[PDB]
């Protein structure tokens, strides 16, 4: 039915979590009519399009929200700048007094010429239309454009902050969550509340109970024991019987070499090596990843990885 990523949206500005400094500064901006152009950037699912929407609903009303807020996605399309944006920023709204708000979601998919045009539009109409850009890679935004507006990095949510909200969601709903299912959910989410709530809802709706095994099977994430097995084949076996074992496991479950390689890197850093061997393992694994990035055979790259581990 209704997804939990929408039912538990923070409707106000204080229901946001883990960004108390940024939220307090934006609230102070609102109180003093000093709201500058904002550039909210960071990893997905961290609360950007919710922060600015709460700020808007606090700033305008619900009927002024169609004629004084231009929610525009930048991934649909230089014409979008001199088109609707320049025609929205330059004109007043008839009876309403106050600035307007333009919300450019995915503001980093814009070509550089479009960002030049938009920077001039911003610079011109800066007292009747406040722009709020939203992106994931501030490096993709022209330094010129970013200079114009104050920047806010919405980093990922630490697991201490985000666990109470998940506990409130669990208690409000009826989810029999284990003491580690929460841990295997926080880990797999990797710090974006959207993915955490989505995974939780989908697994609870598919299997009926969340634990450290059910979430790992619902998301198809390679289990830790399997990667331990692969590292053991590589580290304590013959070359050919390791190739055979690893290939059989890699085809048994759906498993590529990118994921094997990532988890094996984490394990190389986990387990104890003479610290002059992991310099070799790390170098070779970072070369195998580049080799795989160009569309090569995985039957020769897997063998190269086993060769890398055969320094032992």
């Amino acid at each position: 039915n209704l997804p939990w990523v929408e039912k538990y949206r923070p409707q106000t500005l204080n229901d946001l979590i883990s960004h108390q400094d940024i939220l307090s500064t934006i609230q102070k901006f609102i109180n003093e009519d000093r709201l500058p152009h904002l550039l909210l950037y960071g990893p997905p699912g961290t609360g950007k399009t919710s922060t600015i929407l709460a700020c808007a609903k606090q700033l305008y009303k619900d009927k002024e929200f169609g004629s004084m807020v231009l929610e525009l996605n930048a991934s649909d399309d230089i014409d979008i700048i001199r088109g609707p944006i320049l025609s929205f920023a330059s004109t007043r709204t008839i009876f309403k007094k106050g600035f307007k708000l333009v919300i450019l979601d995915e503001a980093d998919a814009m070509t550089q010429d479009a960002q030049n045009a938009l920077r001039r539009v911003i610079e011109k109409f800066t007292e009747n239309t406040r722009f709020c850009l939203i992106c994931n890679y501030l490096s993709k935004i022209i330094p010129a454009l970013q200079s114009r507006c104050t920047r806010f990095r919405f980093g990922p949510l630490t697991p201490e902050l985000m666990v109470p909200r998940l506990e409130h969601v669990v208690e409000e709903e009826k989810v029999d969550i284990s003491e580690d299912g929460m841990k295997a959910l926080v880990t797999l989410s990797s710090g974006d509340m959207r993915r955490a709530l989505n995974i939780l809802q989908s697994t609870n709706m598919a299997f009926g109970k969340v634990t450290e095994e059910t979430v790992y099977t619902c998301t198809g994430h390679p289990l830790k024991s399997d990667i331990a097995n692969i590292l053991d084949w590589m580290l304590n076996q013959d070359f050919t019987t390791a190739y055979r074992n690893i290939t059989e496991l890699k085809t048994l479950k759906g498993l590529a070499l990118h994921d094997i390689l990532t988890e094996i890197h984490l394990f190389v850093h986990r387990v104890d090596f003479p610290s002059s061997v992991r310099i070799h393992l790390l170098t070779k694994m970072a070369d195998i990843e580049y080799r795989l990035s160009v569309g090569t055979n995985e039957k020769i790259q897997l063998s190269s990885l086993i060769a890398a581990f055969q320094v032992t």
Partner: protein
């Protein structure tokens, strides 16, 4: 509604531009004698190109600036039809100016004009040069087709040294009486990277958000990987200590800094570092290789760890 400091303290005459003493000296000569050629000012952002062209046009024309100057931004329609109608009718328009003065057609962001527009602008530049002078500005001076550069003096602009940004920042601080400290000013100069408009924007944003200016506070509004952590990571990599450098690397990765940002800061810090010389060059080589591999799209933590392993094994 008070306007930002980027504009409240915009220099209104070329004696106040701190950018590039030689080029601004040439432009003061032109503002004195008065017969400017079509000039293309090219350079990195934030360094005072638009300001220089505006101050030059003002000092040339004077009170006829409303009548003799035509500015066309990137936010204005500048297709082939506008170049063939509006710019041409302005070049042909009669304005009576003093002996050596000419009308000025400022095409800001000249690298944003399509090729057809510049082709249509060539002969307008060439014919009416007896009464009309063009002053283009751009960042990528190769986006301007060659026949347009052939009829313009290509004035190059360069990034600002840290001393110039510091002088202008102190001139602004004196007028605003903002409480500061040396570490805060060094933080602003580090986050600016030459852009004199970035520095002012960071100064105003920091002062308006918090007041007092200290590095701890500067890195609370800019918020890029603290250069002390990157210095510590490079130091661990100098002592061939991989397990202690990957510590800092995974710490930075935990806070969600994109690997492009991590590499940018690692490069900018390893360039002005305190290693040997040959070792510094051997480090910068590997950092450049990994930057290539990350810009290409292989941006996983494994590539950063491989870079750390190479940096370690350079020093045995």
């Amino acid at each position: 509604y008070e306007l930002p400091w980027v504009e409240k303290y915009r220099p209104v005459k070329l004696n106040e531009i701190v950018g590039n003493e030689d080029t601004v000296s040439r432009l003061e000569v032109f503002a004195r004698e008065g017969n400017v050629p079509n000039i293309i000012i090219a350079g990195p952002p934030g360094t005072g190109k638009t300001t220089s062209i505006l101050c030059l046009a003002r000092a040339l024309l004077g009170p006829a600036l409303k009548d003799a100057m035509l500015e066309l931004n990137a936010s204005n329609d500048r297709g082939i039809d506008v170049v063939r109608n509006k710019i041409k009718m302005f070049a042909q328009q009669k304005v009576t100016l003093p002996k050596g003065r000419h009308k000025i057609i400022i095409l800001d962001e000249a690298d944003s004009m399509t090729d057809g527009a510049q082709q249509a602008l060539r002969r307008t530049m060439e014919i009416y040069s007896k009464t009309t002078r063009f002053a283009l500005a751009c960042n990528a001076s190769d986006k301007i087709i060659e026949p347009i550069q052939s009829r313009c003096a290509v004035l190059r602009y360069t990034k600002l040294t840290d001393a110039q940004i510091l002088t202008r920042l102190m001139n602004v601080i004196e007028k605003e009486r903002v409480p500061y400290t040396d570490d805060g000013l060094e933080a602003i100069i580090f986050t600016a990277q030459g852009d004199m408009r970035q520095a002012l924007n960071n100064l105003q944003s920091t002062f308006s958000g918090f007041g007092f200016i200290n590095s701890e506070n500067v890195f609370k509004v800019c918020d890029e990987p603290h250069p002390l952590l990157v210095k510590e990571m490079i130091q661990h990599c100098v002592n061939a200590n991989i397990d202690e450098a990957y510590k800092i690397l995974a710490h930075l990765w935990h806070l969600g800094y994109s690997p492009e940002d991590i590499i940018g800061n690692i490069f900018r810090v390893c360039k002005t570092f305190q290693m040997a010389e040959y070792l510094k060059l051997e480090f910068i080589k590997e950092i450049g290789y990994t930057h290539m591999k990350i810009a290409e799209g292989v941006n996983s933590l494994l590539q950063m760890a491989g870079l750390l392993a190479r940096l370690c094994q350079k020093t045995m």
